[PDB]
Amino acid sequence: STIEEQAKTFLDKFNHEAEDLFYQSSLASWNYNTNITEENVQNMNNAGDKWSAFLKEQSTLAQMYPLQEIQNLTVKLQLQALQQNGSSVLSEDKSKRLNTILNTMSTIYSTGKVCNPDNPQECLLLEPGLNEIMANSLDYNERLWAWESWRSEVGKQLRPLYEEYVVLKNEMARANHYEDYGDYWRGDYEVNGVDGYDYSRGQLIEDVEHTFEEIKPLYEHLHAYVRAKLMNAYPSYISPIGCLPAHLLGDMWGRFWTNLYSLTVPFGQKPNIDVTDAMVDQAWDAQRIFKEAEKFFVSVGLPNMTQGFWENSMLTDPGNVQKAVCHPTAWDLGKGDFRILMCTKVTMDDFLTAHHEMGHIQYDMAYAAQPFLLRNGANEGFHEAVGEIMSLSAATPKHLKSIGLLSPDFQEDNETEINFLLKQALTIVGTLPFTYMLEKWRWMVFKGEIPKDQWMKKWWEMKREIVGVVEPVPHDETYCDPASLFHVSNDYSFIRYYTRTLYQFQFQEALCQAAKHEGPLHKCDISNSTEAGQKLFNMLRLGKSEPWTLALENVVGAKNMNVRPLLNYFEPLFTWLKDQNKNSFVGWSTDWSPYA
Amino acid sequence: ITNLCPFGEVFNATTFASVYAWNRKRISNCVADYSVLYNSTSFSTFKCYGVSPTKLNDLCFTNVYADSFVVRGDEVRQIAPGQTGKIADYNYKLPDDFTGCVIAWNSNNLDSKVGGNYNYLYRLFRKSNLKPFERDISTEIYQAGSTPCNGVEGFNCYFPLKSYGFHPTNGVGYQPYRVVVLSFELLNAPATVCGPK
Ligand SMILES: *[C@@H]1O[C@H](CO)[C@@H](O[C@@H]2O[C@H](CO)[C@@H](O)[C@H](O)[C@H]2NC(C)=O)[C@H](O)[C@H]1NC(C)=O
Ligand SMILES: *[C@@H]1O[C@H](CO)[C@@H](O)[C@H](O)[C@H]1NC(C)=O
Ligand SMILES: *[C@@H]1O[C@H](CO)[C@@H](O)[C@H](O)[C@H]1NC(C)=O
Ligand SMILES: *[C@@H]1O[C@H](CO)[C@@H](O)[C@H](O)[C@H]1NC(C)=O
Ligand SMILES: *[C@@H]1O[C@H](CO)[C@@H](O)[C@H](O)[C@H]1NC(C)=O
Ligand SMILES: *[C@@H]1O[C@H](CO)[C@@H](O)[C@H](O)[C@H]1NC(C)=O
Ligand SMILES: *[C@@H]1O[C@H](CO)[C@@H](O)[C@H](O)[C@H]1NC(C)=O
Numbered sequence: 084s085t086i087e088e089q090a091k092t093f094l095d096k097f098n099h100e101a102e103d104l105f106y107q108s109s110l111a112s113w114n115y116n117t118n119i120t121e122e123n124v125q126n127m128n129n130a131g132d133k134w135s136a137f138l139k140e141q142s143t144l145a146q147m148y149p150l151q152e153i154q155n156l157t158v159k160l161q162l163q164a165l166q167q168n169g170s171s172v173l174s175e176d177k178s179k180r181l182n183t184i185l186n187t188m189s190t191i192y193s194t195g196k197v198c199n200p201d202n203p204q205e206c207l208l209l210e211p212g213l214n215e216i217m218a219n220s221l222d223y224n225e226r227l228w229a230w231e232s233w234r235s236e237v238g239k240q241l242r243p244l245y246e247e248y249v250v251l252k253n254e255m256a257r258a259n260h261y262e263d264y265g266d267y268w269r270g271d272y273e274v275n276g277v278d279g280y281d282y283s284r285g286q287l288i289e290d291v292e293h294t295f296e297e298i299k300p301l302y303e304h305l306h307a308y309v310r311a312k313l314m315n316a317y318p319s320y321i322s323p324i325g326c327l328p329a330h331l332l333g334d335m336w337g338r339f340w341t342n343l344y345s346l347t348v349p350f351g352q353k354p355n356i357d358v359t360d361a362m363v364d365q366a367w368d369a370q371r372i373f374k375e376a377e378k379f380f381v382s383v384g385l386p387n388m389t390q391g392f393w394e395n396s397m398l399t400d401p402g403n404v405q406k407a408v409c410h411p412t413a414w415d416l417g418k419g420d421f422r423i424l425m426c427t428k429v430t431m432d433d434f435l436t437a438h439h440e441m442g443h444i445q446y447d448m449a450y451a452a453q454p455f456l457l458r459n460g461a462n463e464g465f466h467e468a469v470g471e472i473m474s475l476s477a478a479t480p481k482h483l484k485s486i487g488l489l490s491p492d493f494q495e496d497n498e499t500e501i502n503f504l505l506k507q508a509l510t511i512v513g514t515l516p517f518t519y520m521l522e523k524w525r526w527m528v529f530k531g532e533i534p535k536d537q538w539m540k541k542w543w544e545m546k547r548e549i550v551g552v553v554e555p556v557p558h559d560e561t562y563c564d565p566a567s568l569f570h571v572s573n574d575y576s577f578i579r580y581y582t583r584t585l586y587q588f589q590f591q592e593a594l595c596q597a598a599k600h601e602g603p604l605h606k607c608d609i610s611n612s613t614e615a616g617q618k619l620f621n622m623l624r625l626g627k628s629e630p631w632t633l634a635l636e637n638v639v640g641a642k643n644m645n646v647r648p649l650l651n652y653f654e655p656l657f658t659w660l661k662d663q664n665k666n667s668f669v670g671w672s673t674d675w676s677p678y679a
Numbered sequence: 680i681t682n683l684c685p686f687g688e689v690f691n692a693t694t695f696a697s698v699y700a701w702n703r704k705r706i707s708n709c710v711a712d713y714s715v716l717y718n719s720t721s722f723s724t725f726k727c728y729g730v731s732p733t734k735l736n737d738l739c740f741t742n743v744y745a746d747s748f749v750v751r752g753d754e755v756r757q758i759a760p761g762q763t764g765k766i767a768d769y770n771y772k773l774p775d776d777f778t779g780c781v782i783a784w785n786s787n788n789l790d791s792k793v794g795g796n797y798n799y800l801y802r803l804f805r806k807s808n809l810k811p812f813e814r815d816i817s818t819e820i821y822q823a824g825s826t827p828c829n830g831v832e833g834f835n836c837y838f839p840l841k842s843y844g845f846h847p848t849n850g851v852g853y854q855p856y857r858v859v860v861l862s863f864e865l866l867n868a869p870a871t872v873c874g875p876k
């Protein structure tokens with residue numbers, strides 16, 4: 084009869100009705116991401132519309148219970164989360180048009196193929212066809228072709244769609260009392276009503292920029308070392324003061340420099356820590372990759388993967404029969420259904436990616452006991468970080484010895500630490516400027532600070548300045564090179580991966596301390612440490628019923644994002660790079676370009 | 680005496696009843712073989728309270744009552760004495776002094792279909808908890824607010840019966856489970872339900 088008791092009863096009906104409607108939407112969305120047909124786009128929009136319409140009518144009803152008369156905190160949190168009036172504040176035509184744009188860009192990304200100028204019937208998809216080139220080719224022209232033809236044939240198709248995509252997303256955000264769609268994304272870190280832990284949406288930009296300044300020294304020395312090692316592989320193409328060519332980094336966009344290890348190994352005569360050759364030699368498959376990652380989470384006390392996980396997940400490319408979205412993603416479909424979608428290859432990069440995506444599923448299964456409105460991450464950074472604090476230990480040579488990917492008589496010396504730390508820096512440190520620059524471009528595009536004609540002008544002006552990467556071919560406004568990346572054409576936020584990197588070392592510092600590890604942080608292996616898994620599980624089970632600032636302090640002792648654990652992890656490599664760069668230039672010129 | 684108890688029609692019926700309308704069948708004047716009731720599988724549970732299941736094949740009772748219904752996997756733990764929840768409070772309630780057995784097994788291959796099987800229902804709201812072995816099949820609008828409902832499903836006025844969504848790809852906790860509750864009673868009358876012995 085009281086307002087609080089009416090709210091508990093109202094939430095009870097919401098939880099039991101949203102459980103099935105959200106699951107039907109997840110099922111229809113899965114049938115499209117694995118099987119891209121026009122029929123599956125229809126059913127995906129149908130189950131999605133019935134979920135958005137259910138949220139709107141329930142959000143409207145939720146606003147009739149005033150929070151000022153709710154003494155219960157968890158009830159106040161659920162109502163507060165439900166009263167946010169969603170992406171259904173657009174008209175019916177604009178909502179169906181916006182979803183059509185999103186559906187069109189997603190199909191173009193995962194099904195768009197480029198054909199070499201020689202053969203008009205032999206074409207290559209981005210996966211596995213251009214990803215194999217950008218990762219294993221050492222020819223300057225072969226990499227220049229795949230990098231440019233992907234951004235000229237497929238990237239130009241996304242340009243008119245993305246322009247309209249920005250307009251409709253801003254209308255949806257401005258109808259939500261947000262200043263732009265970029266401010267809407269920054270709302271995931273927002274915390275209100277908690278004394279001593281409140282975090283504003285604008286505070287994120289300050290903390291991201293302030294923390295980035297403390298990362299530049301480590302990146303600039305890693306940049307100079309890679310540039311020097313790249314000159315020995317591409318002699319007549321790279322300047323010792325110029326930026327790096329975008330098509331010579333490990334992947335299509337330069338997101339990770341992981342594939343540049345074989346060209347930048349400090350001590351190549353030492354046993355190679357890249358286990359890719361060992362995995363193929365021992366005849367590993369995608370089943371073995373995930374079973375080993377499954378075994379790692381169990382060693383720390385976390386549960387096995389569900390029986391439905393092994394039956395419903397898609398762990399390999401289904402072939403040419405059905406077109407699929409091969410980008411590694413994890414799925415919390417609801418009703419205890421957990422799946423992973425990944426076109427896994429037999430490489431170490433996919434071995435650590437399996438630990439990343441399984442970290443999502445492990446996090447999803449943890450807070451499954453929470454109420455429906457609180458089954459989410461503390462913030463987007465926490466979610467993508469869980470799998471990475473496991474990759475820190477799974478990549479160490481100690482753990483690789485136990486699973487049998489390194490020789491049993493492997494040793495830990497002067498030059499295996501630098502080999503390992505260099506590889507870890509290519510993956511972890513390399514993506515920090517790439518992530519910050521990419522999200523700052525979208526933040527300014529959504530805010531209106533970048534007009535449509537300079538989109539590609541300001542895009543590469545920031546690539547040269549912030550990331551130290553230069554374009555091999557000059558691009559005009561017909562190109563949409565941000566949209567050539569998965570997270571941009573599939574409507575995901577990217578700053579989650581910047582906070583992920585800084586969070587994962589704050590967590591690792593606390594888990595290694597619970598495991599009573601003695602020594603440097605990079606030699607810590609939390610394998611078979613239930614004390615470490617328990618300290619992590621106690622935070623995963625809370626969902627987002629507690630603010631991310633308070634949830635972070637309860638584990639690491641800091642209310643905010645911090646860089647000290649990140650630099651402490653790479654300090655042995657940082658002093659080694661400063662000595663290896665005495666005969667090199669630390670920095671880059673924002674004017675040099677490999678073209679005229 | 681000589682006839683056989685029809686436990687097959689209880690455990691192996693084609694379709695079970697919703698938990699809010701649970702079915703009860705009285706077993707009398709027959710010989711029962713409790714070693715053959717159901718298919719024991721990896722997920723089946725056999726929980727007895729106050730009676731040894733390894734011995735009731737040598738036991739006699741006045742009457743036996745078999746209550747059968749379908750419940751979510753997460754809620755099978757609620758068919759015990761001294762339990763709470765939406766099922767134990769509103770749909771089916773065993774007394775704190777319970778002397779019987781609760782047999783349950785996974786039925787995801789029978790009660791779940793590709794579109795979702797919404798034929799099993801459960802009561803979500805009730806103005807009071809159920810007394811032990813009480814059944815409530817009333818469809819009456821639940822009054823959550825202070826204003827009356829008068830049979831109108833508007834606001835703070837909810838329909839009391841919700842539907843189970845049984846999909847074959849559901850998690851184990853959201854999969855259908857068939858449950859049979861056996862009650863063994865002893866009265867001043869002669870026993871009529873014995874085992875082979
Ligand atoms: C605030 O709300 C939740 C939800 O009602 C409360 O959790 C309840 O706790 C009591 C006993 O622990 C149970 O009888 C309820 O049934 C619980 N909830 C549910 C959904 O069953 C919580 O205790 C409330 N009180 C406070 C002070 O926060
Ligand atoms: C993919 O979807 C089509 C209909 O759009 C269907 O006929 C086909 O069977 C599906 N493929 C698989 C492997 O399920
Ligand atoms: C998890 O499943 C694997 C299957 O390979 C099994 O070997 C292991 O014993 C299981 N773990 C537990 C704790 O049951
Ligand atoms: C290798 O060890 C020697 C001493 O044994 C030391 O002088 C040198 O700096 C070390 N090199 C590296 C790269 O750690
Ligand atoms: C961890 O434990 C498993 C079995 O419990 C064992 O096979 C493995 O070798 C252990 N690894 C380490 C690094 O101790
Ligand atoms: C019910 O069927 C199962 C197998 O489906 C069988 O083992 C069991 O004996 C049957 N029940 C009875 C009472 O016969
Ligand atoms: C009884 O259960 C097991 C597991 O499903 C199976 O081997 C057997 O066929 C079942 N029997 C029948 C008749 O359903």
Ligand SMILES: [Cl-]
Nearest residue numbers: 726755756759
């Ligand atoms: Cl139990």
Ligand SMILES: [Cl-]
Nearest residue numbers: 763764765766
């Ligand atoms: Cl419950």
Ligand SMILES: [Zn+2]
Nearest residue numbers: 411412439467
């Ligand atoms: Zn990812």
